[PDB]
Amino acid sequence: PIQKVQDDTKTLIKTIVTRINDISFIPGLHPILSLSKMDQTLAVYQQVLTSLPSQNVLQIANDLENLRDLLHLLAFSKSCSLPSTEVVALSRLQGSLQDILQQLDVSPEC
Ligand SMILES: [Ca+2]
Structure with a gap:
């Protein structure tokens, strides 16, 4: 169901954030990313990380x-x-994911 998709998206973001902490913020105040902005942002990090051992x-x-x-x-x-x-x-990815998570409490703009 869609409830599982929204919950799994938030859970996966928390999982990635925890993985980044293992390799080593005001409530209500955050930038707004659209779905397409979120997608373009992750694709940039994806291109960067894939060419890395x-x-x-x-x-x-x-x-x-x-x-x-x-x-x-x-x-x-x-x-x-x-x-x-x-x-x-x-380090940049972690900050970006915490911003995406903060605005996922609502269905984001396309
Ligand atoms: Ca795919």
Whole structure:
């Protein structure tokens, strides 16, 4: 069901954030990303991480592949269409994911 998709998206984001913490923010105040902005943002991090050696990085790259698909499925669900480098990439990714999570309490704009 859709309830499971929304809950699984939030749970997967928390899982990636925890993985990033293992390699090593005001409530109500956050930037707004659209579904297409969220998708473009994760694709940039995906391109960056895939050309990088590490087993922990490979796993995060697979979680991002699931996350982008969930976003496309959420976009379809509301009748709309979307179509050391490592250290700084993971650190930036974590901040971006915490921003996405904070606005997932509502169905985002397309
Ligand atoms: Ca896919």
